[PDB]
Design a protein around this ligand. Structure first.
Ligand SMILES: [Zn+2]
Ligand SMILES: [Zn+2]
Lengths: 522, 524
């Protein structure tokens, strides 16, 4: 059967409502049940935002089981025709990182956020989705087709939960890269001016499509506002970004350059782990290299100065040195995943490892003077993987590196399998930077952060350690803590660790100084 | 004493909050009562939008009598230091035509809408108001100074109730006219692109300044802000705020801009003074009607309005005036109606139609003399002479000027205004490209006395055989509502039926009455 969808954006005082009308053929006139959209992206109770839900041209609608269900009575011939208005709260949805994002001059909804749940979700149907009566001056962008006025998709409901439909009037830019269309949309309040976001996004995409040398016929980049986060979801033909108003240019550039890079690496260049081995085996490559490339992309596009590039790798060396699993072998990392004690530190371990390995490999390849580079080698690796569905066996991947005079297999077995420390060549950041010894204080809170949190009572306070030195003593009524998680994205080294007891205590996590070769300028 | 204000615009999900910190000295340490802002522009219970209200640097606050009050505990020396956050609901405030206008990337507040009520409202103080930690890329404005970052005014609270403070991030344009600064701000959803709005506003504003060729204010702001179902504007010294709907057409705004902002000059600096005892409405035909004429001439000169659309506006005037029940009413009768609070839309609109057609006639007659005369040249002379008497001309001086240029102004005034005689427009008044031709226009006749009907709650005055009678309406039906019923309010469409829901059935018909012949201008 065919499902016809018509969506109208109706701008309001504080939001943009979506008037949705849908028509399809049922088998006969037996009253069937339909369900209101449930958010796969985390909003609790998405049905509360359905303002009205009535039938059209004779189709009757009554109450169903709960408030997420409706009983509709099809026509004798089987036609079903319904109309419902989605009025999403902009205030409530500011806390749902990937929920619906609406505003007085824009709207964005993922497939699950506006589509109706009818029947089997695995069943395939022909979806015709149109945007009608769009306001004057607005630009639209759908993930199912290059012309959001009408898309034609044959897929299942499940497939369509990740799709996107949106529009706005706050910033639009269009350009062509290799004859293919790319559309940029920016709505919401943002410190970075619209022109700087369009230029930066234009450069990042143009660089990405140059690397791998013709792609998608249509692609959209939608920037939408949400406080307290800088996140993005990637899709086929679209990249959606929910970011806070106070986002710095580099913060958005690093995210744009990293999440869009995931469409190639590991999207079209995946290293197949051996039989039975987990997907995390090659996280150093599928995540650490992507970040390295993302950094190399910004510096090439003249968006990130080389001095900041040095501090990004310096942070990788400092963060990996403070990682408690920095020396853990494959057998230990894989055992923690089967044992589910896999904290933020474990999540970040392969990012720090893989980024520095790529920096070393590039330096080692470019020192050859034969015009080689980690990038030239990744283009060969990706072109070869095209004849195998974008995947490469472990032997085929390391065979290529060995052909370019690079000991790829030895590095992986050393640093990833055996957990041996990673050495970065000194010429990696150009001749203007040189690694010089520096002492960085290790992260020692002076108390067991987890045993305390578990028992809600200060436990294991090491006498003479930082926590002891602040006055804290073991067995104390732990109330709360702030800036104590070392490997979550917002940890700051210049800010003290706060801990509240029954009284607020603050101290820096001072510990045995270690020496690291950080990159300095000349 | 000195009152010192600090305002922080804090963007939010659906609005922009205002963190206001105020510092002033009390006469003593004895507790005093301060009351939250009340809206002079019509917002019920504006205090409900005050989220927090606390003391600062040792000053204590407590509850007071009602929700509008607060008990402030000054310091021993008398120092009072308060901080309160205004978080205005953009949804409910869309219904208040002149209430606070906020939203995700902008804010606008009138003086009364953010300032605190401290002591006597007519006591003069020195108000120093600064906008701090404003968001990056936002542009701000104030009516108390050309630099919104810090203004300084010695005025009373009452004077400051009509002041304006605002900013935004959805559109800004600045330009200079004869060395003076003008800034334009646009926020909210609007069908007309920002470039079109800025170009038109710059053209209209420049045209108005060259018309009188006087040095305008050192700073001037024009703030376009969103609000459903209305197209309104409030004129202030140093600022013109406009709250309009998203679907506003360009000409609708162009007429609003050109008309409202001309009132700075006419009657602002050129008022005809009525004789002793006479109401100020006597010259509403000159202070409103002629302003509408010059606003239309202004738009055509700036190429924002074609000449075909100018003819229609005057055709509209002829039709609207012919439908006006008070069209032939003398001045004593129209002055009798103001004293009995009967001024309705028909009355407030009578002087608009009257004065605009007279201005059109007067211009044709002046230019027919072939001596380079024109109504615009005449108004330049009148404005210049008025500058020596305070923007004010006696009736004798005003009319002496017109009679000097061969125009019998006085005669028309005591024939069309004072006596209510019908107004004749010279056929050549719209140029050789247009000709007045007789057209038959159906008179407005609901077949029912609306005014009477709305005064009671039943149907009053249904004429057996009128349009309302044939539609099915009768004498004595519980009257509930009406749509498209006010003929002289801006929104009446002769092409949409008159809707009257009685009892509860809905009667929709056309208020078509006896035919009328009028000479409308048509293209050749
Ligand atoms: Zn990633
Ligand atoms: Zn007026």
């Amino acid at each position: 059967g065919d499902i016809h969808y018509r969506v109208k954006p109706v701008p309001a005082a504080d939001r943009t409502d979506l008037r949705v009308t849908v028509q399809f053929q049922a088998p006969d006139a037996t009253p069937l049940t339909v369900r209101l959209p449930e958010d796969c992206y985390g909003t609790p109770d998405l049905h509360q935002y359905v303002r009205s839900f009535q039938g059209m041209d004779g189709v009757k609608v009554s109450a169903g089981g709960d408030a997420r269900e409706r009983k509709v009575f099809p026509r004798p011939d089987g036609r079903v025709s319904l109309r419902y208005v989605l009025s999403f709260d902009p205030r409530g949805l500011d806390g749902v990182s990937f929920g619906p994002n609406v505003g007085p001059g824009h709207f964005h909804v993922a497939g699950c956020q506006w589509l109706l749940r009818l029947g089997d979700a695995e069943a395939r149907r022909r979806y015709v989705i149109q945007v009608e009566d769009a306001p004057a001056g607005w630009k639209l962008y759908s993930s199912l087709g290059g012309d959001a006025l009408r898309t034609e998709t044959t897929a299942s409901y499940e497939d369509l939960t990740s799709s996107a439909l949106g529009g706005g009037s706050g910033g639009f830019h269009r350009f062509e890269v290799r004859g293919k269309s790319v559309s940029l949309f920016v709505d919401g309040a943002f410190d970075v001016p619209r022109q700087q976001l369009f230029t930066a996004l234009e450069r990042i995409i143009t660089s990405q499509r140059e690397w791998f040398q013709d792609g998608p016929d249509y692609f959209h980049v939608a920037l939408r506002p949400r406080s307290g986060i800088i996140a993005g979801v990637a899709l086929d033909h679209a990249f959606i970004c929910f970011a806070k108003r106070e986002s710095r240019p580099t913060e958005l550039h690093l995210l744009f350059a990293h999440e869009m890079f995931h469409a190639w690496l590991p999207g079209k260049l995946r290293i197949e782990p051996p039989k039975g081995e987990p997907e995390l085996r090659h996280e150093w490559f599928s995540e650490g290299f992507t970040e390295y490339f993302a950094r190399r992309l910004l510096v090439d596009a003249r968006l990130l100065p080389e001095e900041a590039l040095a501090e990004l790798f310096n942070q990788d060396l400092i963060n990996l040195a403070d990682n408690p699993h920095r020396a853990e072998t494959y057998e230990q990392v894989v055992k923690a995943s089967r044992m589910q004690a896999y904290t933020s530190a474990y999540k970040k371990l392969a990012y720090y490892r893989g980024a520095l390995m790529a920096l070393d490999w590039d330096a080692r390849l470019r020192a050859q003077g034969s015009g080689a580079s980690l990038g030239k080698l990744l283009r060969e690796l990706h072109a070869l993987a095209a004849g195998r569905g974008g995947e490469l066996s472990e032997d085929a991947f390391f065979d290529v590196l060995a052909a370019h005079g690079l000991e790829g297999r030895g590095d992986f077995e050393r640093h990833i399998l055996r957990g041996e420390p990673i050495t970065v060549a000194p010429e990696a950041l150009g001749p203007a930077f040189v690694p010089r010894a520096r002492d960085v204080a290790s992260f020692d809170p002076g108390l067991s952060l987890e045993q305390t949190f578990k028992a809600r009572v200060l436990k294991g306070v090491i006498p003479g350690g930082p926590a002891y030195e602040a006055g804290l003593r073991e067995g104390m009524k732990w109330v709360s803590a702030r800036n104590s998680s070392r490997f979550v994205n917002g940890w700051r080294a210049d800010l003290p660790l706060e801990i509240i007891v029954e009284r607020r205590f603050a101290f820096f996590p001072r510990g045995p100084v270690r020496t690291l070769m950080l990159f300095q300028p000349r």
